[PDB]
Amino acid sequence: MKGDTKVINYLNKLLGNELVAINQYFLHARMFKNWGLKRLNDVEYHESIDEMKHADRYIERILFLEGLPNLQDLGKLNIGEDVEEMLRSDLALELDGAKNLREAIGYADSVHDYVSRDMMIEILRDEEGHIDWLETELDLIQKMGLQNYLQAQIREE
């Protein structure tokens, strides 16, 4: 069913954000794991899987609308070297991605692609869940100090 060409462009843009976040959150998780921070490995691994499922939804919707999914261009990752920098970089990526989502949701409504809009609002709700987690962990680092925070990451939850 042929979709609106700009909707497809947005979906490819948002797919590009997911591709970045898949890789950044997967590398972060295994860096946490190598450091023995098991609680952080588990959550970041999960977040990477969530982004993978978001990418799947975009790819399928692009194909249904008769566009070409763009998995070739990968935007810039910002890996970071310590726990706090890694989480802050993940939050920055989510905040930028949420901005792109809100723009695309309003456009899809304007051209009456209400199914694409509904799918994106569901994805946005997941992203705001990630933002909440990231902000909350960052606040805990500053409330209990980095050393107490790291001790709390050794065991799985």
Whichever of 5 and 79 has its CB closer to a copy of itself, that residue is 79
Work out the burial of residue 21: count CB atoms within 10 Å of its CB; fewer than 13 is exposed, 13-18 middle, 19 or more buried: buried
- Please choose which of Zn ion, a copy of itself, Na ion, none residue 51 contacts, taking the beta carbon within 5 to 8 angstroms, the exact cut-off set by kind: Zn ion
Question: Is residue 76 classed as helix, strand or coil in its secondary structure?
Answer: coil
Torsion of CA 6, 52, 141, 101, to 10 degrees: 10
Which residue has its beta carbon closest to ligand ZNH? Answer: 52
- Please choose which of Na ion, ligand ZNH, Zn ion, none residue 54 contacts, taking the beta carbon within 5 to 8 angstroms, the exact cut-off set by kind: Zn ion
* Site track for ligand ZNH across 20-39, x = CB under 6 A: --xx--x-------------
CB of 60 to ligand ZNH, least distance (A): 10
Residue ranges in 53-112 that form contacts with a copy of itself under rule CB under 8 A = 56, 59-60, 63-64, 68-69, 71-74, 76-77, 79, 95, 102-103, 105-106, 112
C-alpha closest to that of 86 among 123, 144, 141: 141
Output the CA–CA distances (angstroms, integers) from residue 22 to 49, 112, 141, 145, 148, in the order listed. Answer: 7, 30, 24, 29, 29
Whichever of 22 and 124 has its CB closer to ligand ZNH, that residue is 22
Whichever of 77 and 88 has its CB closer to a copy of itself, that residue is 77
* Site track for ligand ZNH across 35-74, x = CB under 6 A: --------------x--xx-xx------------------
Chain center to CA of 15: 10
The residues, any chain, with a CB within 8 Å of residue 122's CB and separated by 6 or more, are none
The answer to whether the CB of 70 falls within 8 A of the CB of 13 is no
Residues making up the binding site for heme b: 52
